[PDB]
Design an enzyme around this catalytic site. Structure first.
Site, PDB file in Angstrom:
ATOM      1  N   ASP A 128       0.759  -1.585  -0.393  1.00 38.17           N
ATOM      2  CA  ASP A 128      -0.023   0.520   0.186  1.00 38.17           C
ATOM      3  C   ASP A 128       1.242   1.181   0.198  1.00 38.17           C
ATOM      4  OD1 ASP A 128      -2.629   1.964   0.249  1.00 38.17           O
ATOM      5  OD2 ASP A 128      -2.538   1.337   2.867  1.00 38.17           O
ATOM      6  N   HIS A 171      -0.821  -0.316  12.887  1.00 32.02           N
ATOM      7  CA  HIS A 171      -1.000  -1.533  12.269  1.00 32.02           C
ATOM      8  C   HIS A 171       0.194  -1.425  11.485  1.00 32.02           C
ATOM      9  CE1 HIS A 171      -2.767   1.001   9.634  1.00 32.02           C
ATOM     10  NE2 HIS A 171      -2.673   0.274   8.448  1.00 32.02           N
ATOM     11  N   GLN A 233      -1.955  -6.031   6.902  1.00 31.02           N
ATOM     12  CA  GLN A 233      -1.517  -5.545   7.664  1.00 31.02           C
ATOM     13  C   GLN A 233      -2.729  -5.744   9.509  1.00 31.02           C
ATOM     14  OE1 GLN A 233      -2.872  -1.955   5.107  1.00 31.02           O
ATOM     15  NE2 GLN A 233      -1.118  -0.918   5.676  1.00 31.02           N
ATOM     16  N   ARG A 263       3.652  11.605  11.235  1.00 32.19           N
ATOM     17  CA  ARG A 263       2.621  11.873  10.976  1.00 32.19           C
ATOM     18  C   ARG A 263       1.819  10.488  11.288  1.00 32.19           C
ATOM     19  NH1 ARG A 263       0.226  10.359   5.259  1.00 32.19           N
ATOM     20  NH2 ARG A 263      -1.467  11.628   5.299  1.00 32.19           N
ATOM     21  N   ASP A 265      -0.676   7.971  11.397  1.00 30.65           N
ATOM     22  CA  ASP A 265      -1.182   7.520  10.983  1.00 30.65           C
ATOM     23  C   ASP A 265      -2.182   6.223  11.581  1.00 30.65           C
ATOM     24  OD1 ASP A 265      -0.172   8.784   8.150  1.00 30.65           O
ATOM     25  OD2 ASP A 265       1.586   7.530   9.215  1.00 30.65           O
ATOM     26  N   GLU A 307      -2.455  12.815  11.475  1.00 26.94           N
ATOM     27  CA  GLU A 307      -2.808  11.916  10.058  1.00 26.94           C
ATOM     28  C   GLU A 307      -4.180  12.476  10.173  1.00 26.94           C
ATOM     29  OE1 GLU A 307      -3.905   8.796   9.183  1.00 26.94           O
ATOM     30  OE2 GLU A 307      -4.704   9.921   7.149  1.00 26.94           O
ATOM     31  N   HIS A 376      -0.979  12.773  -1.806  1.00 27.97           N
ATOM     32  CA  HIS A 376      -0.435  11.087  -2.296  1.00 27.97           C
ATOM     33  C   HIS A 376      -1.775  10.661  -2.895  1.00 27.97           C
ATOM     34  CE1 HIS A 376      -0.621  11.206   1.705  1.00 27.97           C
ATOM     35  NE2 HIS A 376      -0.689  10.178   1.550  1.00 27.97           N
ATOM     36  N   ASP A 377      -2.913  11.421  -2.155  1.00 32.40           N
ATOM     37  CA  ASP A 377      -4.554  10.940  -2.130  1.00 32.40           C
ATOM     38  C   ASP A 377      -5.191  11.409  -3.120  1.00 32.40           C
ATOM     39  OD1 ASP A 377      -4.155   8.033  -0.558  1.00 32.40           O
ATOM     40  OD2 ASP A 377      -3.589   9.547   1.349  1.00 32.40           O
ATOM     41  N   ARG A 494      -4.458   6.001  -8.132  1.00 34.29           N
ATOM     42  CA  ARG A 494      -3.682   7.344  -7.748  1.00 34.29           C
ATOM     43  C   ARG A 494      -1.751   8.061  -8.352  1.00 34.29           C
ATOM     44  NH1 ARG A 494      -4.702   5.933  -1.108  1.00 34.29           N
ATOM     45  NH2 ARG A 494      -4.145   4.066  -2.899  1.00 34.29           N
TER      46      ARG A 494
END
Length: 600
Positions: A128, A171, A233, A263, A265, A307, A376-377, A494
């Protein structure tokens, strides 16, 4: 219990600055940990040992970093000179040392905060985009090793740049050393994850869970593993103090390698509780308070950034609620503003932005926003669900219509995005009309398109906190459809807005007549002005004056700064007495998509 004993464990065999901070922040850390693990029989023994380990890591922190720690003032990250940049290390310069060699470019742009996307060891195969972390203590080999991270951050500090690193705390990859130990039968590490002998308990959880489909059977462990995201994950069991301890230590080791911002997440899923949606639980915030306390003691030069991509009405808690306000995350992403900017642009409605800023939760002391235009998303329009319903000052608007516009699924669109209400992929330049104008060799449309891009960035740059430029936007880089031609990325749309840096295009920043040079120069102008405006510091108020013209948006900072925006395709003006002004520019006429900055 017994504070002096714990202080001694932390202190070691034999430090004044470090210990003074421990004396002021350790109690908050201890209460957090007791609330979460205090009832465990192993709590006391675990705590004493862990604090000893924390103390050792603290004392080995590089002197240069210890200096930042003792000289940085609270809220340093929110000052006007702060400007951010987000990029993939490999896409930007191939490797970590490569990124370091490109620091002069970042320094010329005015960058003081650099976010490098996941660069730690990631899962073999699908990972991912690096968010399936297989090792928090080592850099992905193709980018370099810890030695190079150290050299990179040292180089960055030479330009006054703070490195922000992703810390995926919810995770790990299913090939992380802990996971491999679990696979090998180590009960100790199996317990670092939420595992179940059978579906009985998982079924009870799932009854109130949602889908982002939360458990995966794994042969090697012969157990059901909690997997909120991808099957590969595994969710860590934060109810286990050893997990908190090792992750806290992993965070400090990264800080000692030069990481200055984290960050955090997927923090919403940190705590599980049967009967609840296992999201945004009180305990998840208590965990962040604990991690923050650890940094206040050991590495106060560091900042904690949530995040969490959610409606701004769900962000206040991350800065700490009630008694913990000001003692949790330093920063949070203002995604509502980001999506509102593109919505306002496509609909030519400044009233949507007024709604967002007028309702933007006031920042706690020493906290700030991370404002941005792209990342990036894909653009997740759903965060605006609330605003889209409209209110007494702003009529409703269609998110589906906005999405279709940027996906160019509507007759008169200058946008060239691609649907991922579904998100929208594509570079800021592509969405703003620059790509389309270039494809048609339309000089007139290109100029207007440049105004739209600059407009959205001007908004981010006037915000309290860190404005984050997405790699290439300063050069108006367009989409990269290339990923569509290789079976390894083809399935990930993406990639369309995850191009490799074009250093030749970057060289054109010097030709004021080129598109890149024009966009770069304009953004640079705003960056410099922002750097000179004390009114823009994060401790200064952020508000929006209600105007009677829905096409316009007025953003105020402190009591001496006003930014006026025209989100329509027509020339218009704003009366001074409508904004109680008559100052200096940095009625007032606003060209289409124009922005104007004024001060007392």
């Amino acid at each position: 219990i017994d504070p002096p004993a714990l202080r001694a464990a932390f202190a070691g065999p034999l430090a004044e600055v470090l210990l003074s901070r421990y004396d002021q922040h350790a109690s908050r850390l201890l209460d957090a940990l007791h609330a979460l693990y205090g009832q465990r029989a192993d709590y006391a023994s675990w705590l004493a040992q862990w604090l000893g380990e924390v103390g050792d890591i603290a004392r080995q922190r590089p002197q240069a970093l210890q200096t930042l720690d003792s000289t940085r003032h609270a809220g340093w990250f929110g000052q006007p000179h702060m400007l951010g940049y987000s990029a993939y290390a490999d896409r930007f310069a191939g490797t970590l040392q490569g990124v370091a060699e490109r620091v002069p470019y970042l320094q010329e742009l005015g960058v003081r905060y650099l976010h490098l996307l996941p660069f730690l060891r990631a899962r073999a195969g699908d990972n991912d985009g690096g968010f399936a972390v297989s090792d928090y203590g080592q850099v992905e080999p193709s980018l370099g090793s810890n030695d190079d991270l150290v050299a990179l951050t040292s180089r960055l500090r030479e330009a006054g740049i703070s490195l922000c690193a992703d810390f995926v705390l919810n995770h790990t990859a299913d090939d992380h050393a802990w996971a491999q130990a679990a696979r090998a039968g180590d009960a100790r590490y199996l317990d670092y994850y939420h595992h179940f002998a059978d579906r009985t308990v998982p079924d009870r959880y799932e009854a109130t869970l949602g889908q982002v489909g939360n458990f995966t059977w794994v042969d090697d462990t012969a157990q059901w593993m909690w997997t909120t995201f991808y099957p590969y994950q595994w969710d860590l069991n934060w109810s286990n103090p050893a997990v908190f301890g090792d992750m806290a230590l992993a965070m400090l080791r990264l800080a000692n390698l030069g990481v200055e911002a984290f960050r955090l997440d997927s923090t919403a899923y940190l705590w599980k509780r049967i009967g609840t949606d296992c999201m945004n639980q009180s305990e998840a915030h208590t965990l962040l308070v604990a991690l923050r306390a650890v940094t206040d003691i050991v590495a106060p030069a560091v900042v904690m950034k949530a995040e969490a991509i959610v409606p701004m009405t769900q962000l206040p808690p991350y800065f700490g609620s009630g008694v913990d306000e000001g003692h949790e995350c330093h920063l949070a992403y203002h995604s509502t503003l980001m999506a509102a900017g593109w919505s306002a642009l496509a609909l030519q409605r400044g009233d949507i932005l007024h709604n967002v800023i007028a309702h933007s939760p006031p920042l706690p002391r020493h906290c700030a926003w991370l404002s941005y235009v792209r990342c990036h998303d894909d653009i997740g329009w759903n965060v605006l669900q609330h605003e889209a319903c409209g209110n007494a000052a702003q009529p409703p608007f269609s998110l589906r219509d906005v999405a279709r516009f940027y996906a160019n699924a509507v007759p008169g669109s200058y946008a060239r995005g691609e649907s991922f209400v579904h998100g929208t992929n594509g570079m800021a330049a592509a969405l703003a009309g620059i790509q389309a104008a270039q494809e048609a060799g339309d000089a007139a449309a290109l100029a207007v398109a440049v105004d739209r891009l600059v407009l959205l960035y001007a908004i981010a740059l006037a915000m309290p906190g860190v404005p984050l430029i997405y790699m290439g936007d300063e050069l108006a880089m367009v989409n990269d459809p290339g990923y569509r031609d290789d079976p390894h990325r083809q399935h990930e749309g993406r990639w369309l807005h995850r191009p490799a840096m074009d250093w030749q295009l970057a060289a054109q920043r010097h030709d004021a007549k080129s598109l890149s040079g024009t966009v770069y120069r304009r953004l640079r102008g705003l960056i410099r002005q922002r750097a000179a405006l004390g009114a823009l510091a994060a401790d200064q108020a952020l508000a929006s004056i209600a105007l009677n013209d829905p096409r316009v948006f007025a953003l105020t900072r402190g009591d001496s700064f006003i930014a006026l925006h025209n989100f329509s395709d027509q020339l218009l003006d704003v009366e001074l007495a409508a904004i109680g002004v008559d100052g200096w520019t940095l009625s007032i006429v606003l060209p289409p998509y124009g922005v104007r900055w004024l001060q007392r």
